[PDB]
C-alpha cells in the first residue's frame, strides 16, 4: 500500500565512489519495475535470473539498491563471473546473481573541467572481494618485503586512485552511474511486491 522509494536512489544528487558503494535496503512497499525499464534513458539494463515484466509480478523479502560511479569501460565488470579492477577490488556480484544492473552516462553531472577528483576506486588490494563485500580502508599498500607504516614511497602506495573525470574524455573514460537491484528471497515474510 506504499511506493518503494526508487527515485531517491536513481535520482540522487550525489553518488558514492565505487570502493565505498552505497546500499539502500528496501522493505515494506510496492515496487513498479515497469516504470524503471520504460524510462528507457539507460545505456545498460540487464537482468539475471529474472525478467522486468515478469518480476513486476513477484514478491521478495527485501530489495537492495546498490549505487556508485565507475568508468564506462568498467560497466561490463558489473556482472556475474567478471574479473578486473572493479569486480576484484571494488564491487563484486555473486556467481549466482539474481537481479538487475542499470547504468547510464553521467558525464553532464560527474565530470568537470580540470577534473573531478571526488570519485575514486581501489587500485591495489592483496585479495579479491567476496560478493557484496565493501572495503573502505585507506592503509598504505605494501608491495615489497619492507613494511610501509603509513608513509608513501617505493613499494608503498596509497591504495585508491581518482577517476579525475573530465567532460572531454573518451566515452569509455566518462563517468557512469550504476544501480544494482538485488532481490533477497529469505524464509521470512515478503515485504516488497509488484
Amino acid at each position: 500500500t506504499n511506493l518503494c522509494p526508487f527515485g531517491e536512489v536513481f535520482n540522487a544528487t550525489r553518488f558514492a565512489s565505487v570502493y565505498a558503494w552505497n546500499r539502500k535496503r528496501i522493505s515494506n512497499c510496492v515496487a513498479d519495475y515497469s516504470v524503471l525499464y520504460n524510462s528507457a534513458s539507460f545505456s545498460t539494463f540487464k537482468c539475471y535470473g529474472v525478467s522486468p515484466t515478469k518480476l513486476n509480478d513477484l514478491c521478495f523479502t527485501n530489495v537492495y539498491a546498490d549505487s556508485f560511479v565507475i568508468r564506462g569501460d568498467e560497466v561490463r565488470q558489473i556482472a556475474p563471473g567478471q574479473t578486473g579492477n572493479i569486480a576484484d577490488y571494488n564491487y563484486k556480484l555473486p556467481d549466482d546473481f539474481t537481479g538487475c544492473v542499470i547504468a547510464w552516462n553521467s558525464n553532464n553531472l560527474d565530470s568537470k573541467v580540470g577534473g573531478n577528483y571526488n570519485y575514486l576506486y581501489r587500485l591495489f588490494r592483496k585479495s579479491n572481494l567476496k560478493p557484496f563485500e565493501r572495503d573502505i580502508s585507506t592503509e598504505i599498500y605494501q608491495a615489497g618485503s619492507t613494511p610501509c607504516n603509513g608513509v608513501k614511497g617505493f613499494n608503498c602506495y596509497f591504495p585508491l586512485q581518482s577517476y579525475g573525470f573530465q567532460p572531454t574524455y573518451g566515452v569509455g573514460y566518462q563517468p557512469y552511474r550504476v544501480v544494482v537491484l538485488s532481490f533477497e528471497l529469505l524464509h521470512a515474510p515478503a515485504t516488497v511486491c509488484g
Partner: antibody
Amino acid sequence: EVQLVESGGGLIQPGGSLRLSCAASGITVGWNYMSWVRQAPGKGLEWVSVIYPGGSTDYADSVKGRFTISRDKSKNTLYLQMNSLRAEDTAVYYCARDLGEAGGMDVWGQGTTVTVSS
Amino acid sequence: IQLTQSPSSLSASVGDRVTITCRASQGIPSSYLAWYQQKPGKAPKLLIYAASTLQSGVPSRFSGSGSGTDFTLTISSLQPEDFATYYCQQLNSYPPAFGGGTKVEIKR
C-alpha cells in the same frame, strides 16, 4: 638491488612448449600486477600477459589459449608457460612490475630470448 | 585506443631542445600516459608516468606534459647518452597501447 631475472628462453620447434621464469628480489610478485612484454626482432614492445595481486589474469589476443601466466609466491617467482609456439613468438621476453597510474612499468628484467624455428 | 607518435625519427645535436609528441585517438586521463626510453639490445626504462611525473633517478632534463589527446616528452638539453628510441604508453588498460616510437639520432 631491486631486480627481476628471467630465464628459460631458447630454441624450440613450432608447436612445442617452453616455460619462462622470472625470479624477483626487492618486490613481492604475489602483491603486484606482474606482466610479460615481448619484442620481436626489429619491432616494438607487445604486452603479452598480466597477473593481478588478487590472482586475476589477462592475455593479449594473439596468445590466448596458448600461454598461461602463473606464479610461485613461496619462490617469489613469475612464470609464463608457452604452448603451441609459433615462429611469430620469436622475441625477447621481459617480465615487468606494473604500477598502472601509480607508476609505470618501473622494474624490468634483462630479457630472455625465445627462438621458434624448425 | 591508438597512440600515434611523431616524428618517427628526429635528428638533433647535443644541447638541443627535443620535443616528441604522442597523440591519442580519443581523450584519456593524464594519469594513463607513460614515457619509456630504449637503447639497442637493452630493456626499456621508465622515464615518466602519469604524463608529467618524473621517475625517481631519471635526469631532470626529461619532462612530460600534455592532456586530453596530446602529450609531449621534452628533453631540454640533449646529452650524448640521450640518443635512443622513445615510446609512449597508455596504462590502466589490458591490453595497453604503445606509440610507434621516435628514434632520436645524431644530426650531421
